[PDB]
């Protein structure tokens, strides 16, 4: 009665009005399970989230169908989808006639990957609402994911038959997408079967005038003909796709196979020249030839014919357009283009031909920057700037050269010069913020970055940057705070040595290291939180893409969701953060400036109390934290061919799981090794771990597999490594060095061997190893 009044007001968004009533109920029946659960959801909707969880837990400790439904909504709200499924089921089991639960179930089940049960939910909902097309598509999809391709197709075809001439204009798009999806399912089943592929082709032709995804239709068609062996009748299709988008390199490369001229370059150059006439402004016609030709007089006509009219019009990316040719064919191309533009430059007057002059200088600066001729690079770009000081692009290229030379502060300053010319442009601002972070200048970076952020309730844009998921800024800042951490640690161990006002200083240095170690880890932990949201963001789409009618696209979402914790920025943050977590495990085995907190605040006051990240760095279980916050999710999704075996090796070494360490090492040797210095590095570290004093069986596997690779029965390992794996394997050395405690090998003679191996590296790379890894 009175509880039912309060349930309406939840759907009616009158959350306080609802609570007013529920308090009256619980005043005279504080043990009323129904009221308690609904109170939690009302209090969450506000949301006083700490009271909400307490009211819910109290209700749960006391064990209705409507109560189960309310719990289920709350659990989904708190991302407890597994518990949401328990309570949504309990509503049905305890006599609910609301058939909308089956749709909410299918959503949750799909969300947690349980498609077996999703198929059941899809079916029962479809049986309760055959009227709506979304529920058919929904069902067909669930069958598809459970391998029932033929059952899926049948479901789609049944709706098609029921609505042969019943599709309105507002339904035409959804219809179009469901046709191609049915074609998709058929296509899979056909594999390479000629008869079936002919039927798939048949099907594609009937739907064409009702399918609006022409590009999609045509791409499918071309792949069919190729599978049928009708290569010529596929070439006609690839030529239609090129005419619809003559800037797609992929369509050109496929046509080479379609006409079977892929082999000889004589036939290829004849084609692209003919294409050049049709699409003169497009890239592939003129670029593709360059990849294969060796006939000097023939290609140098074209390279010149390609790169000059770009420099004529003054396109910035000209060099970037040919950087592959450089990268792939350094020997053949780089001493040839050099001359072919340097002599063009020689015929250019700066007053009469300004645009071509300055951009021809821009190319040559990048040219000699690539060849590691740093004075030559600076020379030409200086010439460009002095000529026309109003192009931000010239300051960008210049600042790259100085970063390559290790002059981080100078480089950042050059961008800062360019930034002031154009305060409307965020790209230059970003690149400036990036370079200042690289020179460990965080205050300046934050200041500059804050010029483009909504700072309505913060002193700077840190919060706003977390709100828009700006991983670019957050990963970089994390890494800077890490460098500032290590640098101020060394200055603490140098202050420890000088004991013969220093006590004032070390007290300040001891705050700085805690502050910078904490904020580094704080910032690295913002990334996984983003990607966990990305996973949660799929929730709505389990039902939304069914109504809108985008099943092909929804299936792609699922694959995308299954790869989230393997994407470059998640992996970058993980690996970098491991350095901190690992060392915190190693180390334990062997306020007034709370005013300052305001400027480092990343999350709202309500949610976050630990702003400097003190709890994070002073945890008692660093290895469990790394697993929960980063490693676990990456491990369950990552593919074998992209798996970082060095990381999982180093991970298992600190949780007492050596058997795995062997597996990591073993698998690494199968792809890369077994002559890699890293393979050596890891092996030697694992062997020492087996026996005898070490606090931890694996020896068996060592002698089983790699007896002829190492002198196992056991000496000079550092020498032996220089014999077996070569001295100049820089990375294997570094690996050993960080295990100098648990594996002594003349750590000093290792250190210098590394220092002697640095000579061939670029300035910045030498300095950073010298400063941050040793």
């Amino acid at each position: 009665d009175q509880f039912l009044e309060a349930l309406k007001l939840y759907e009616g968004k009158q959350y306080k009005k609802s609570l007013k009533l529920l308090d009256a109920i619980l005043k005279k029946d504080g043990s009323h399970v129904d009221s308690l659960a609904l109170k939690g959801l009302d209090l969450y909707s506000v949301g006083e989230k700490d009271d909400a969880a307490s009211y819910v837990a109290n209700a749960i400790r006391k064990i209705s169908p409507i109560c189960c439904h309310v719990l289920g909504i709350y659990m989904r709200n708190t991302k407890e989808y597994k518990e949401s499924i328990k309570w949504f089921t309990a509503a049905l089991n305890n006599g609910s006639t609301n058939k909308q639960i089956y749709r909410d179930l299918a959503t949750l089940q799909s969300q947690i990957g349980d498609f077996k049960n999703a198929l059941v939910s899809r079916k029962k909902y479809w049986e309760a609402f055959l009227g709506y097309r979304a529920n058919w598509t929904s069902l067909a999809v669930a069958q598809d994911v459970n391998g029932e391709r033929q059952q899926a197709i049948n479901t789609l075809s049944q709706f098609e038959k029921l609505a042969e001439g019943k599709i309105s204009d507002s339904e035409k798009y959804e219809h179009s997408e469901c046709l191609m999806y049915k074609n998709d399912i058929m296509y899979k089943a056909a594999s390479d079967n000629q008869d079936k592929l002919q039927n798939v082709l048949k099907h594609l032709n009937d739907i064409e005038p009702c399918v609006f995804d022409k590009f999609g239709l045509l791409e499918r068609k071309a792949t069919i003909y190729m599978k049928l062996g009708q290569l010529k009748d596929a070439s006609i299709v690839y030529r239609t796709l090129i005419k619809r988008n003559p800037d797609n390199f992929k369509y050109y490369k496929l046509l080479e196979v379609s006409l079977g001229i892929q082999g000889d370059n004589k036939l290829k150059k004849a084609l692209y020249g003919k294409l050049e006439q049709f699409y003169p402004r497009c890239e592939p016609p003129k670029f593709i030839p360059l990849t294969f030709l060796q006939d000097k007089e023939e290609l140098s006509k074209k390279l010149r014919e390609y790169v000059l009219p770009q420099l004529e019009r003054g396109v910035p990316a000209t060099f970037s357009n040919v950087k592959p040719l450089y990268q792939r064919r350094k020997s053949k191309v780089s001493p040839l283009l050099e001359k072919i533009v340097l002599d063009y430059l020689s015929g250019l007057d700066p007053t009469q031909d300004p645009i071509p002059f300055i951009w021809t200088n821009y190319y040559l600066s990048q040219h000699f920057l690539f060849l590691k001729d740093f004075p030559k690079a600076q020379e030409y770009i200086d010439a460009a700037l002095d000529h026309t000081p109003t192009l931000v692009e010239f300051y960008i290229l210049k600042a790259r050269i100085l970063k390559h030379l290790g002059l981080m502060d100078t480089a950042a300053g050059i961008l800062e010069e360019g930034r002031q010319l154009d305060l409307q442009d965020r790209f230059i601002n970003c690149k400036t913020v990036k370079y200042f972070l690289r020179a460990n200048n965080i205050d300046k970076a934050v200041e500059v970055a804050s010029l483009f952020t909504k700072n309505d309730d913060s002193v700077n844009g840190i919060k706003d940057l977390h709100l828009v998921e700006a991983s670019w800024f957050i990963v970089e800042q994390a890494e800077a705070y890490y460098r500032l951490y290590l640098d101020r640690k060394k200055k603490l161990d140098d202050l420890a040595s000088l004991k013969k006002q220093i006590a004032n200083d070390i007290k300040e240095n001891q705050w700085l290291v805690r502050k910078y170690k904490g904020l580094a880890l704080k910032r690295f932990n913002a990334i996984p939180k983003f990607y966990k949201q990305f996973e949660d963001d799929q929730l709505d789409f389990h039902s939304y893409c069914m109504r809108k009618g985008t099943p092909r696209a929804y299936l792609e979402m699922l694959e995308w969701g299954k790869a989230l914790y393997t994407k470059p920025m998640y992996v970058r943050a993980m690996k970098e953060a491991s350095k901190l977590y690992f060392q915190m495990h190693d180390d334990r085995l062997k306020k007034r400036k709370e005013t300052e907190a305001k400027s480092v605040a990343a999350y709202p006051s309500d949610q976050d109390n630990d702003v400097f990240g003190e709890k994070l760095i002073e945890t008692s279980t660093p290895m469990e934290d790394f697993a929960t916050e980063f490693y676990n999710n990456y491990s369950m999704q990552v593919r074998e061919d992209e798996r970082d075996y060095i990381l999982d090796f180093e991970f298992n070494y600190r949780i007492g799981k050596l058997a795995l360490c062997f597996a990591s090492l073993n698998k690494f040797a199968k792809r890369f090794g077994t002559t890699s210095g890293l393979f050596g590095s890891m092996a030697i570290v694992l062997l020492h771990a087996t026996r005898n004093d070490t606090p931890f069986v694996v020896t068996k596997s060592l002698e089983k597999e790699y007896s002829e690779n190492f002198p196992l029965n056991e000496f000079d390992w550092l020498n032996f490594y220089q014999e077996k794996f070569g001295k100049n394997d820089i990375n294997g050395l570094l690996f050993l060095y960080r295990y100098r405690d648990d594996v002594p090998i003349g750590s000093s003679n290792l250190k210098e061997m590394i220092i002697s191996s640095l000579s061939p590296l670029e300035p910045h790379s030498q300095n950073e190893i010298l400063q941050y890894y040793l």
Partner: protein
């Protein structure tokens, strides 16, 4: 369109104008001079583009003996983009504002020693009024110099 066009200055591209002004006319202009244009005198600003590149600009003032009308305070073009009508377009804009403001006079103070520039103004229908004004320009480095005043009547 013409390869050279004009467009407005805003607070975002004010640094463009200062860089143009600092290379073409070193030492004359204070840092705060450009600030006061958008920190908020009735001013008129404009930039000159060649192939969408900032290669010149104008800063002109409205002033209510005479010494009246539109004062040119900056008119600069990068070296290599000179002799392409660009400085003339910037001048014509300043003249056009003079007419739009219902003013009948445009004037400018040049360094008395700078002759190449003096003739370029006179070539555009300017004429000297009076003679060398004693120590009128003050440089950022402290230095000083006599200046000359050119005047052109706009009907």
């Amino acid at each position: 369109r013409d390869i050279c066009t004009l467009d407005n200055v805003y607070a975002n591209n004010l640094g463009m104008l200062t860089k143009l002004a600092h290379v073409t006319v070193p030492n004359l202009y204070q840092d705060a001079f450009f600030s006061a244009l958008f920190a908020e005198d009735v001013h008129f600003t404009q930039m000159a583009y060649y192939s969408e590149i900032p290669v010149g600009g104008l800063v002109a003032k409205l002033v209510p003996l005479s010494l009246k009308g539109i004062q040119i305070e900056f008119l600069g073009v990068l070296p290599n983009y000179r002799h392409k009508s660009i400085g003339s377009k910037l001048l014509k804009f300043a003249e056009d504002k003079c007419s739009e403001c219902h003013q009948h006079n445009v004037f400018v103070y040049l360094p008395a020693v700078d002759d190449l520039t003096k003739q370029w103004f006179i070539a555009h229908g300017f004429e000297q009024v009076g003679e060398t004004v004693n120590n009128f320009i003050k440089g950022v480095n402290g230095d000083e110099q006599d200046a000359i005043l050119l005047k052109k009547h706009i009907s």
